[PDB]
């Protein structure tokens, strides 16, 4: 089931999130200063999701921004480097603390080169999601039923994926390395917005 | 004496000269830690003098130096600490912390140039001239040549002054918090290199 | 329905074009000084098309060239950079003014890398066209029925595609950037014919 | 006085010296406008003298200079205006027009060479010698060095004469209309760069 | 139908070739000094082919070599640059004169990038051949029926392909350019054997 | 049929190997100092296999290590360069002597670019194996039935593949070159562990 | 007189000096024939003197020179004739034949080096020193500078001697027949370049 | 006499000077053995003198030299023997064994540098200066120039001393067994090059 919102999540539906917050975003493209934030989706892990539609030029969302900046509740992304930069560009908020399931996948799933959400979900959870609506118009006047289902499917399994990946990082001894990556991720995202988006700051160049 | 020479470990007396930040560099047999052994460790307190410590083959202990490296009350200054931190962890098992990297700081504030080596940084920021001719030499040699000893000392003699200059630039241009976060992740970046992620950015897609 | 012509469109069938002119060409290849113009197709947007067969060495087509140079009627291409250069190389005419639906696609469809006509037509218009006859012999002595249908299908939907893309450029605020691109397109095509065809003149090299 | 120094904006008296085309260049902290702030704006009327205007950090207004930049009755001469036009639009919100780019003109008529930088263009077309040693310096410095001031002025002192030489070449070789169309699209090319199309030709397939 | 021979074609079956000779070879690989010639197939254009099995170290084939060096009978290859070098390396014979249908394809079929035999045969002749046996062991003790059928299919249509391509080169005005290419082809092949196999001798380097 | 072992092969099941030993390994990835050895599989060529599960941090396996270092029994790998390095990294043993069927494939199957085990097995032996379980979690608490079947299938045909490839190396005269490659292979693997893993030591750089 | 200057075409008297092979080079406005016009044609009979012929813009006729170019009884010597043959065919419609290319000959017999330019070939084979500084100049200039005239003449003054030296090398190393076949295909190679195959080898798969 | 010249083969008297290892290099017409013929073979016993043997065109026999090359009781020292071993096998059919390659040894122990050429190795290990100017010359020349003869001799005069220096480094850094295995495979590596595997590592996946 999906709860649809315009502009911001209701304070009522924000209270359902008493722990970690699974979160994803939908934009018009991969360049934040060019392609505006259109949708942000949330899920508390109970099999339901909140889908919030963002309007052009909208620069505030009090209930959502409070959840994002809340240091007592962890935020779960799959490749948070992009979403953290977009949310900071749109609302000026620094999402923290974070768990990135793609960084976790790269650190423990060393036997494969597939670290996208789709391949992670079927190997670790035996869950099949579709990638058909990823390249659609997320700024449409009316989000299609398939678009709303795709957006929710991006957050409905992030809690369970994090738990399975965390057990792998424990088994293979890289949980501290992953924790250090999550602490730097907000800085990595802010460095992307400033023009270092295609260079590793820790390299020689 | 401008250069204090030590065999195996720094003396406790000279280790007491370091009441604050410690400038540090290393010399190895190459750029692969699991292949090329650590040969020299050079330190400087910033007063124009340096300690040069010769590391023997197969040596896995240096308690006086290792204590300074792990001491969270004294900051360690490197130029491209990503490599040296990895060599020190591979050799002694010590995680150097906390660190300041003048190369990361240079890439974050000297945005008008692509020259981020130590020689170029010392030339612009401090008008100091150093030569890099002895970097490709046998650092495991029987006896280190005098030219080798001066190159090793000159690699740490100006790191204090360079850090001060670059810190003022990061504060002026508003990226001191970005650099501090980079320094906190640097020991993890080095440990990921030792594990085989040395040629990939862990924060990228692939 | 398709109206076939040899050498030039009839003055009768040119009068059906009281507004924008959808236009495409078919050649023997992508190098204009090597591969001759074989077919030029037109459509006024009513669901019908004129298909004009061009003979080797033919250097004039009065009714068509008058339409191309007419500044009161807009010409619609999908990737006009190629067709404008070919028409200028064959007839010495500078087609103006132009609307390029591929430039428009690149400027507003920022969520995808597919900017060809086929993917544009199905997303924006839900229209499916075949690309089977694109790599055929367009200098054949008799154009096949499939060739004539492929040629017409390249212009039958350019009016409706332009309208949908224009609404997107309006919604996303890049209609002035697209208009500036269309004004430079004839110069970009002429620069290609002179040997700058593989370099961006606005770059350092 | 060969160099007129200004703080923040050009004086109204010196702005009156520009009755025709305005040669113009900028100095920044780097090549990324959203990261590297605008530091200096240099102008020259073509009489051998230059105005050098220091731009403060966070400054978003310069009415006397901005009026000259937007004035459609006076042409602005750049060398690679694609970058400067973007920096000026990002800093002041002004769309510089109309413009002449001696680099675009050089690439369109000097077809016998791949050297299209300003130094090479001034050497062949005018036999003028300029040095580029100070381009990689701190242009946000506390006080601009005299070598910095002369480099900044020399970047605009010859743009009038270079434009005249290249215009005669474009007329002779029959591509003045191609260059004029390139100049008309240049402000859009710069704005597309600021939006993230900076490393792609919008007129290509991909 | 296929006529099988060991070592050399019979003088009887060589007399069936009163005109152009379609010819192809099969080897153990693409490096002539490493991978030996295993099979050479011939066809006179009547729908039948001679398939000659070559033994290891065999350095003579009088009836075949006489056909190859015969200047009165044209030899047809598809990409003769390879086969001419192999035949010269094995028997010391310089095949001349030649018609290469791949060079002809590259010169007149300017609307496509597919210049292999398979795509040439279906577009120009509406003939479908299989490429399944191309990467098999041609030095096997017994050539399989599929291997013999694949080898013959490489020469059964070279006459008809040459005729259709020659008409295209005539129509598009590059028949003299193709003739000049065929005259240089034996030198191009000999230059390959000497180590210039990966550089264009007419370039700067 | 498959014989499962934990930690080491039983001395009873080691006595079944009176000749060459087919052997493969399964790891958590391709970097030995990062990805631990999980499984090593053996087969004597009778159609049955021993599958030994290796525990994390386990640094000894007496019965297996004795087989690996036994100079009187040849060890057969497909691409032994990787497995020899992993076994030397885990147990400190130098496997010798070895026959690598991938080196043999590259030296005699000169007509193809496919030198993996799957393509080698179907061409030379007409045997079809699946590659589905290659990218699985080999450090799982319980190896799946499909994982155990995949692991055994990697060694069940190495004897027969070696024999067929050895006959090809004899026929084409490169058996001495292959023998020289096998003698250097343990050094090539040890050079990989020391950081020369992406450079050919015999090149200029 | 070491350099004979001509406007438009070589005089009939000076054309009579060429009883055998003709060394020839051209100067253009660039490397794209359909964009960059032919400016100068230089010839030399091998006696230490050269004819330098200035080609006007839009000129499509030069009967005295064109006759020498098409004359199958006199061989034309180029260094990288692939380009010049294309420029001459595009400008005058003449197919230069027969030709000898000292660059193709150099690549076929000087197998011990990668330096196949004219300057390197003249240095090793003849110990002649020529400079290439004037190759990137305005050859359509109002008046050709004296340095331009000497560079143009020096490009043809030694082609006879270089051809003789390289021919003896091709005969010695057994590749004179390979070079002769390359020379016979060269006019077709140039015409394929003018048609858009300029960046592909027609004898390759793609 | 510092250089002993021979035509076709080394004399039996001078071949008797080699009681131990034989330093050896070759000069060819290029880097492709099947195209570029062997021209010179240079040997040195390590006493400061060298034998320089001119190889005629089409020559396929040199019994005195070939016996030294195949002699398993005397080691042959090359710098990058991979090429010379291939040229010798292609020319005479001899498999040179056993061999020591100072380049392979340099890449295995001089891990602090990327400069593994002979000139750089002689400069660091022995402080000997040699020039490489004559490597790109006509070694099939009518008469070898004196500069050619000295370059050829200097390529073998120091291989004994260089091998001794590098052997001590391999023993010190623990990779003498790796180098010995590389030397044993080297003749096979060269023969694979002659068969068309010259641009691929046979030990890689592809
Ligand atoms: Mn998503
Ligand atoms: Mn996402
Ligand atoms: Mn360092
Ligand atoms: Mn250092
Ligand atoms: Mn079309
Ligand atoms: Mn089109
Ligand atoms: Mn500028
Ligand atoms: Mn400037
Ligand atoms: Mn075939
Ligand atoms: Mn073939
Ligand atoms: Mn396996
Ligand atoms: Mn394996
Ligand atoms: Mn030339
Ligand atoms: Mn020239
Ligand atoms: Mn050598
Ligand atoms: Mn040499």
Residue numbers in the entry:
A (entry chain A), C (entry chain A), E (entry chain A), F (entry chain A): 4 to 208
B (entry chain B), D (entry chain B), G (entry chain B), H (entry chain B): 3 to 208
Q: Paper's wording?
A:
The crystal structure of apo-At_NrnC was determined at 1.5 Å resolution and those of two forms of At_NrnC-Mn2+ were determined at 2.5 Å and 2.3 Å resolution. Metal binding was found to exert only a minor influence on the overall structure of At_NrnC. Based on the arrangement registered on the active pocket, we considered one of the metal-bound structures to represent an inactive state and the other an active state. In addition, nuclease assays indicated that Tyr153 is essential for At_NrnC function. Indeed, in the structure of the active state, Tyr153 was located at the typical catalytic site for DEDDy enzymes. In the active pocket, Asp27 and Asp86 coordinated one Mn2+, while Glu29 and Asp157 coordinated the other Mn2+. The distance between the two Mn2+ ions was 6.5 Å in the inactive state and 3.9 Å in the active state. According to the superposition, the two Mn2+ ions were located on two sides of the DNA backbone, which is similar to the case of Mg2+ and Zn2+ in the Klenow fragment structure.
